[PDB]
């Protein structure tokens, strides 16, 4: 078939499946939605209650994680990295709100909310990544403990699969304890309640996009845009993903722009925006308001404008390539302004002075203060 | 299915659709042709009349452009590149005959023929490029002005898609002028008549293959071969495409060879040649004469020989990978000559002296002077 | 469809087609097998009798070759590499048992057994490699001599395809000899009997994994693991494949582990092992004994344990990515040991001391001495 990107209708998408576990919630968007198929990604949102432990798992696809809310810690068990010092374990890293974290394909990991508010992560799973060599339709997830529900469609964690004897032998451990590995008798789900706890090897593997000094774009009382790519997060050189966080203040807008190289899974973090998206046909495929917890998939090259309402509008964009670049159509550093004025007047059939105003009437860069 | 490269018949291909615009012509080859599906490319040829302005557009796929005829200028609006100095615009670059230009995915651009003869560009659109994340069947093109016809299959340029108000607001411009953006009232097509006009940021993004000093191969009264790859055109490191131009003089031939790594879209620029192509089965899939404006798709690894006729034969080869490499079967630096003579005689069941002549009777490299 | 990696059953796979030639045998596994489709590879094994010459050929896919048995020499005709000094030919390289050799896509090559025992190579053909731009279902092979049978499904070597005249002309050779090229009158098949014979340009393009000093893992009376990746075989940076050889001594085991980034085509070289493989569902998809000449496909991220029997168990793993990395679940440098003990006890619902033993009772790295 291969026509999933012939899109004339996009939708504000919300999770269509829930997975309730003892200490957390996993909400799964519908990966069958055409625009997800086009983008080749899946999105989940996990809400881990305080003292909740997301059991160790891995997925064949790389993930881009935004910590929407809360703080906690994630342990990554990267093969080959140094033990640490009783007890030994690999580097524990901290998760905080505003954090954009990169999970390389196959890397096993667990998370724990050691904070007071629920820990909330919005996870892009890039099933179409070159790194994912399993199926492209749905993420494949392998758990290392518990008896977790399938997240994307007689089952258990990978240990349940092995002959119990082999397990016991493997760990130099009793059979009875091996059965604990297999968690055949476990009903807690993928996020369990705990009490308390207590170069890739050394990098943070994250950058906090709430750090206003890191913004690439600010416009006085318009807002800011903060990019995560291969320069501030070098691992993204390997994942070939990037990300951005945007804040639009009351009635501010992001000029119509298109992303050159990447699909943009724009998740609304807070506020509300009139979002309009146009396809290659010059047809609007989207003209709706996005608010908390909704996302829209902006396909590569699809033109888009974001107009904040009175409460502003804030989003994280997961981008399906390395150093995704976009181009504003209006403003300073825009397609129009890059056009020689004669080209502008000629292509739009307007005066050299109408052209001028078309080019320069908008002095802001990318983010504008607007009236609502 | 995935059998589009099971090819037993190739065809001399010509455009199957025309798109007439006010100041230019766009001829589109049939991307459904099996060998195009196999190669994962589309080909167009644009003829821009003098004083003709190819409206700004972009496509999700990278393009390799050969300027077959004429000269003019192209403006590339690469996001982030410096303005220039009344008026400000991005770097204007010159296009001349023999130019092989690389357009990265998503980069918006316009062209203008400021010369006296029609400006003619043969464009390979590499829809199967990793850079293209939309559909693979047909190029997706987005225009920034006018009301252009679909080039590959109630429509308009991307601005037509937006709420007019939002447009006006975006540019700090009147509504009436915003409607000009949307060009709902435009009948000029994608190439309009104009009057006159007047690290990637600084590179030429082109090399002229008509520069005889750049030839990698010359053979006295046989002709020349000139390659564009990542060394003389570094951007091609990003596009993962390469190109070559070949000139065969009267009755000269390019020895049977195969390309190791890439499909070869060989477009005939001038002259005429008996071209023969063999598949993995040892079957001829092509044995016809190519002339002006026709192309054949040579699939990766398919063996091919090109025999010029009395007027010679000249072609541009667009190659679907980085630094595509080929191997001659005959001549100096050929498969046969690289074979130890005993291997040759043994595999061909011939004498050590028949073998010798098989190896050395052909002292030329790649291009030979032949009799017609 | 795209569900070939939804695997609940793997099989010990053996060749399903034989191709007998005059001086050798070619055994072809069934590339239609679901797990081959999932992995996107094909496997062949060629047995070249002493004094046997594997005719020159190339395939659009890169190959990883393990010399299971024997020694001989392979000639690679890489385009552009220096002639050598009567006779001139390209660098001849030696093949020996334990050799893991990398063949880049499209590179023409022949092999010859100049040894006394049959020369046996197990060949992974990575049809799903980015380098292969032809069909993905089956390897495409082009021969440069003889009249070889199709290896994967009115035919001949590529020369047979050309007009004989053109051939003769091409090589400056008589017609009668040109017909020898076309081998229309040849019944020897792809491996013929001979008598005797006699930066990529200069690299060995191989590393011998039988070199015990190169082992990355040894465990006293357990065995060893030896990896071939981009560091000891730099060309693999281009192929994006890796390999390993494993030897398990009597009753030794490789702890349950999963490969993070790559499918693992594990071919059994000698001995016998109880191999168990688990999918993402916690279901065993394989629990059988592998022995000489059988392979199983371990999909990326599928968990696996290998238990040698009394004769030990030795395998070569062809891996479908660059520097494939795996993670042991048990032992030193394992997922479990990388887990903070509180996470372990909490996720497995066991004591801080049961947890401890789960973590540390297994002091070996990856390879363990076990009881059978």
Short mmCIF file of C-alpha atoms in Angstrom, two decimals, chain B residues 38-325:
data_model
loop_
_atom_site.label_atom_id
_atom_site.label_comp_id
_atom_site.label_asym_id
_atom_site.label_seq_id
_atom_site.Cartn_x
_atom_site.Cartn_y
_atom_site.Cartn_z
CA UNK B 38 12.67 -0.59 -8.13
CA UNK B 39 14.98 2.47 -8.08
CA UNK B 40 12.68 4.42 -5.79
CA UNK B 41 13.00 7.65 -7.70
CA UNK B 42 11.05 9.97 -9.88
CA UNK B 43 12.37 12.08 -12.69
CA UNK B 44 11.17 15.42 -13.96
CA UNK B 45 12.47 17.83 -16.54
CA UNK B 46 11.59 21.49 -16.30
CA UNK B 47 11.93 23.85 -19.18
CA UNK B 48 11.80 27.39 -17.92
CA UNK B 49 11.42 29.95 -20.68
CA UNK B 50 13.59 33.10 -20.60
CA UNK B 51 12.38 35.53 -17.91
CA UNK B 52 10.57 32.58 -16.33
CA UNK B 53 10.35 32.18 -12.57
CA UNK B 54 9.95 28.70 -11.08
CA UNK B 55 7.89 29.56 -8.02
CA UNK B 56 9.37 28.63 -4.65
CA UNK B 57 8.64 25.09 -3.54
CA UNK B 58 10.10 22.24 -1.57
CA UNK B 59 9.79 18.46 -1.64
CA UNK B 60 10.33 15.98 1.16
CA UNK B 61 12.87 14.16 -1.02
CA UNK B 62 16.43 15.33 -1.86
CA UNK B 63 17.03 16.16 -5.51
CA UNK B 64 19.92 15.94 -7.86
CA UNK B 65 19.61 18.50 -10.60
CA UNK B 66 21.45 18.64 -13.90
CA UNK B 67 21.24 21.85 -15.90
CA UNK B 68 20.95 20.40 -19.37
CA UNK B 69 20.68 23.74 -21.06
CA UNK B 70 20.85 27.43 -20.36
CA UNK B 71 21.79 29.46 -17.37
CA UNK B 72 19.94 31.26 -14.63
CA UNK B 73 19.93 31.58 -10.89
CA UNK B 74 18.48 29.60 -8.07
CA UNK B 75 17.68 30.92 -4.64
CA UNK B 76 17.86 28.42 -1.79
CA UNK B 77 16.17 29.45 1.45
CA UNK B 78 18.08 27.33 3.90
CA UNK B 79 16.86 27.83 7.48
CA UNK B 80 19.47 29.66 9.54
CA UNK B 81 21.68 31.01 6.78
CA UNK B 82 22.70 34.69 6.80
CA UNK B 83 20.75 37.51 5.21
CA UNK B 84 22.62 39.59 2.66
CA UNK B 85 22.76 43.29 1.69
CA UNK B 86 16.99 48.31 -0.11
CA UNK B 87 16.70 44.54 0.25
CA UNK B 88 17.91 41.51 2.15
CA UNK B 89 17.77 37.94 0.90
CA UNK B 90 19.72 34.71 1.14
CA UNK B 91 22.61 33.79 -1.14
CA UNK B 92 21.65 33.69 -4.79
CA UNK B 93 23.57 31.07 -6.69
CA UNK B 94 24.15 30.74 -10.41
CA UNK B 95 23.03 27.83 -12.55
CA UNK B 96 24.87 27.02 -15.76
CA UNK B 97 24.82 24.25 -18.34
CA UNK B 98 26.71 21.22 -17.11
CA UNK B 99 25.83 22.06 -13.52
CA UNK B 100 25.00 19.22 -11.17
CA UNK B 101 23.26 20.75 -8.17
CA UNK B 102 22.16 19.00 -4.93
CA UNK B 103 18.90 19.96 -3.21
CA UNK B 104 18.65 18.60 0.36
CA UNK B 105 15.25 17.32 1.45
CA UNK B 106 12.74 19.97 2.43
CA UNK B 107 14.82 22.94 1.29
CA UNK B 108 12.59 25.56 -0.28
CA UNK B 109 13.88 27.01 -3.52
CA UNK B 110 13.00 28.94 -6.62
CA UNK B 111 14.74 29.28 -9.96
CA UNK B 112 14.80 31.97 -12.61
CA UNK B 113 16.04 31.97 -16.16
CA UNK B 114 17.96 35.20 -16.62
CA UNK B 115 19.49 33.87 -19.81
CA UNK B 116 18.44 33.91 -23.45
CA UNK B 117 17.85 30.23 -24.22
CA UNK B 118 15.37 28.05 -22.36
CA UNK B 119 16.72 26.91 -19.00
CA UNK B 120 16.45 23.14 -18.77
CA UNK B 121 16.98 21.03 -15.67
CA UNK B 122 16.75 17.28 -15.39
CA UNK B 123 15.78 16.45 -11.88
CA UNK B 124 16.18 13.18 -10.07
CA UNK B 125 13.88 13.06 -7.05
CA UNK B 126 15.04 10.40 -4.65
CA UNK B 127 11.77 9.47 -2.98
CA UNK B 128 13.36 6.39 -1.44
CA UNK B 129 15.99 8.53 0.35
CA UNK B 130 16.15 8.07 4.13
CA UNK B 131 15.58 11.84 4.16
CA UNK B 132 12.08 11.44 2.68
CA UNK B 133 9.77 10.38 5.51
CA UNK B 134 6.50 10.79 3.56
CA UNK B 135 5.24 8.29 0.98
CA UNK B 136 7.73 6.46 -1.25
CA UNK B 137 5.47 5.99 -4.26
CA UNK B 138 5.47 9.58 -5.55
CA UNK B 139 7.30 12.82 -4.76
CA UNK B 140 5.41 15.16 -2.50
CA UNK B 141 5.78 18.77 -3.51
CA UNK B 142 4.76 21.85 -1.55
CA UNK B 143 4.62 25.25 -3.28
CA UNK B 144 4.96 28.60 -1.56
CA UNK B 145 3.11 30.60 -4.18
CA UNK B 146 0.72 30.30 -7.12
CA UNK B 147 -1.85 27.64 -7.88
CA UNK B 148 0.36 24.84 -9.32
CA UNK B 149 -0.97 21.59 -10.76
CA UNK B 150 -0.11 18.40 -8.90
CA UNK B 151 3.04 17.13 -10.52
CA UNK B 152 2.57 13.45 -9.70
CA UNK B 153 -1.13 12.43 -9.84
CA UNK B 154 -9.63 22.14 -4.84
CA UNK B 155 -5.85 22.56 -4.47
CA UNK B 156 -3.10 25.18 -4.29
CA UNK B 157 0.12 26.38 -2.60
CA UNK B 158 0.55 25.84 1.13
CA UNK B 159 -0.72 29.31 1.98
CA UNK B 160 -4.07 28.54 0.37
CA UNK B 161 -4.43 26.06 3.21
CA UNK B 162 -4.39 28.59 6.02
CA UNK B 163 -7.19 30.71 7.38
CA UNK B 164 -6.62 34.01 5.54
CA UNK B 165 -6.90 36.00 8.75
CA UNK B 166 -4.13 33.95 10.41
CA UNK B 167 -2.05 34.62 7.29
CA UNK B 168 -2.50 38.39 7.39
CA UNK B 169 -1.80 38.41 11.11
CA UNK B 170 1.25 36.22 10.60
CA UNK B 171 2.91 38.59 8.16
CA UNK B 172 1.67 41.83 9.72
CA UNK B 173 -0.07 42.33 6.42
CA UNK B 174 -3.52 43.28 5.17
CA UNK B 175 -6.09 40.57 4.41
CA UNK B 176 -6.26 41.50 0.73
CA UNK B 177 -2.52 40.89 0.43
CA UNK B 178 -2.80 37.65 2.41
CA UNK B 179 -5.20 36.44 -0.33
CA UNK B 180 -2.41 37.09 -2.79
CA UNK B 181 -0.35 34.58 -0.84
CA UNK B 182 -3.16 32.11 -1.36
CA UNK B 183 -3.23 32.78 -5.08
CA UNK B 184 -6.77 31.45 -5.35
CA UNK B 185 -7.01 33.83 -8.33
CA UNK B 186 -3.86 32.61 -10.11
CA UNK B 187 -3.70 30.78 -13.41
CA UNK B 188 0.00 31.02 -14.21
CA UNK B 189 0.96 27.57 -12.96
CA UNK B 190 4.32 26.76 -11.31
CA UNK B 191 6.60 28.68 -13.68
CA UNK B 192 5.59 32.29 -14.09
CA UNK B 193 6.68 35.13 -16.37
CA UNK B 194 8.39 38.25 -15.03
CA UNK B 195 10.60 42.84 -16.14
CA UNK B 196 13.58 41.35 -14.31
CA UNK B 197 15.00 40.60 -10.86
CA UNK B 198 17.25 43.00 -8.93
CA UNK B 199 28.75 25.77 6.00
CA UNK B 200 25.91 24.84 3.60
CA UNK B 201 25.11 28.57 3.63
CA UNK B 202 28.35 29.31 1.73
CA UNK B 203 29.05 26.22 -0.46
CA UNK B 204 28.12 26.24 -4.15
CA UNK B 205 26.12 23.02 -3.73
CA UNK B 206 27.03 22.26 -7.34
CA UNK B 207 29.86 21.14 -9.57
CA UNK B 208 29.95 21.65 -13.33
CA UNK B 209 30.64 18.30 -14.99
CA UNK B 210 31.41 20.00 -18.29
CA UNK B 211 34.75 21.03 -16.79
CA UNK B 212 37.11 18.77 -18.73
CA UNK B 213 39.86 19.09 -16.09
CA UNK B 214 37.56 17.42 -13.57
CA UNK B 215 37.04 14.28 -15.64
CA UNK B 216 38.15 11.13 -13.79
CA UNK B 217 38.42 9.33 -17.05
CA UNK B 218 39.55 10.46 -20.44
CA UNK B 219 40.51 8.19 -23.31
CA UNK B 220 41.88 9.76 -26.54
CA UNK B 221 39.05 9.90 -29.08
CA UNK B 222 36.86 7.72 -26.88
CA UNK B 223 35.50 10.35 -24.51
CA UNK B 224 35.26 11.17 -20.82
CA UNK B 225 33.53 10.37 -17.57
CA UNK B 226 33.14 12.92 -14.80
CA UNK B 227 31.88 11.99 -11.36
CA UNK B 228 30.10 14.05 -8.76
CA UNK B 229 30.35 12.49 -5.33
CA UNK B 230 31.07 13.43 -1.73
CA UNK B 231 34.64 14.62 -2.44
CA UNK B 232 33.95 17.33 -4.99
CA UNK B 233 30.41 17.89 -3.69
CA UNK B 234 30.56 17.35 0.09
CA UNK B 235 26.84 17.92 0.65
CA UNK B 236 26.35 14.60 -1.16
CA UNK B 237 27.60 13.06 2.05
CA UNK B 238 24.20 14.08 3.39
CA UNK B 239 22.04 13.24 0.38
CA UNK B 240 23.79 9.91 -0.22
CA UNK B 241 23.49 10.45 -3.94
CA UNK B 242 26.10 10.75 -6.61
CA UNK B 243 26.15 11.55 -10.30
CA UNK B 244 28.26 11.26 -13.41
CA UNK B 245 28.35 12.75 -16.84
CA UNK B 246 29.67 10.76 -19.75
CA UNK B 247 30.67 11.76 -23.23
CA UNK B 248 31.31 9.09 -25.80
CA UNK B 249 32.66 10.35 -29.08
CA UNK B 250 31.73 8.83 -32.45
CA UNK B 251 31.58 5.01 -32.26
CA UNK B 252 33.24 4.97 -28.85
CA UNK B 253 31.99 2.70 -26.12
CA UNK B 254 31.98 2.38 -22.37
CA UNK B 255 33.05 -1.18 -21.62
CA UNK B 256 30.48 -3.50 -20.09
CA UNK B 257 30.39 -2.55 -16.43
CA UNK B 258 28.15 -2.77 -13.43
CA UNK B 259 27.54 -0.36 -10.63
CA UNK B 260 28.41 -1.90 -7.25
CA UNK B 261 26.30 0.13 -4.96
CA UNK B 262 23.64 2.14 -6.71
CA UNK B 263 20.81 2.29 -9.24
CA UNK B 264 21.77 4.34 -12.20
CA UNK B 265 19.20 6.57 -13.82
CA UNK B 266 20.95 7.22 -17.08
CA UNK B 267 19.45 10.14 -18.95
CA UNK B 268 20.55 10.75 -22.51
CA UNK B 269 21.64 14.32 -22.99
CA UNK B 270 22.60 14.18 -26.68
CA UNK B 271 23.61 11.79 -29.42
CA UNK B 272 22.53 8.18 -29.55
CA UNK B 273 23.73 4.87 -28.18
CA UNK B 274 23.09 1.16 -28.44
CA UNK B 275 22.63 0.36 -24.79
CA UNK B 276 22.50 -3.18 -23.56
CA UNK B 277 21.63 -4.21 -20.01
CA UNK B 278 21.75 -7.65 -18.44
CA UNK B 279 20.11 -8.86 -15.25
CA UNK B 280 21.15 -11.40 -12.61
CA UNK B 281 19.86 -14.22 -14.80
CA UNK B 282 22.24 -13.48 -17.66
CA UNK B 283 19.23 -12.26 -19.65
CA UNK B 284 19.26 -9.08 -21.70
CA UNK B 285 16.56 -6.80 -20.31
CA UNK B 286 17.40 -4.00 -22.62
CA UNK B 287 18.91 -3.72 -26.07
CA UNK B 288 17.70 -0.52 -27.67
CA UNK B 289 19.10 2.85 -28.73
CA UNK B 290 18.83 5.79 -26.35
CA UNK B 291 18.68 9.33 -27.68
CA UNK B 292 17.97 12.87 -26.55
CA UNK B 293 15.65 13.16 -23.59
CA UNK B 294 15.22 9.46 -22.95
CA UNK B 295 16.45 7.67 -19.87
CA UNK B 296 16.83 4.10 -18.83
CA UNK B 297 16.99 2.85 -15.30
CA UNK B 298 19.95 0.61 -14.68
CA UNK B 299 19.33 -1.30 -11.45
CA UNK B 300 22.18 -1.76 -8.99
CA UNK B 301 24.47 -4.54 -10.10
CA UNK B 302 22.85 -4.87 -13.52
CA UNK B 303 25.59 -5.14 -16.13
CA UNK B 304 25.61 -2.57 -18.91
CA UNK B 305 27.52 -1.50 -22.05
CA UNK B 306 27.08 1.77 -23.93
CA UNK B 307 27.98 1.97 -27.60
CA UNK B 308 27.94 5.44 -29.13
CA UNK B 309 26.90 5.91 -32.74
CA UNK B 310 28.33 8.33 -35.32
CA UNK B 311 27.20 11.43 -33.46
CA UNK B 312 28.57 10.17 -30.17
CA UNK B 313 26.49 9.72 -27.05
CA UNK B 314 26.33 11.80 -23.91
CA UNK B 315 24.47 11.06 -20.73
CA UNK B 316 24.01 12.10 -17.16
CA UNK B 317 23.73 9.30 -14.62
CA UNK B 318 21.92 10.06 -11.39
CA UNK B 319 23.03 7.50 -8.84
CA UNK B 320 20.97 6.39 -5.87
CA UNK B 321 23.82 6.28 -3.37
CA UNK B 322 26.83 8.04 -1.97
CA UNK B 323 29.99 7.73 -4.07
CA UNK B 324 28.44 5.12 -6.31
CA UNK B 325 31.28 3.03 -7.67
#
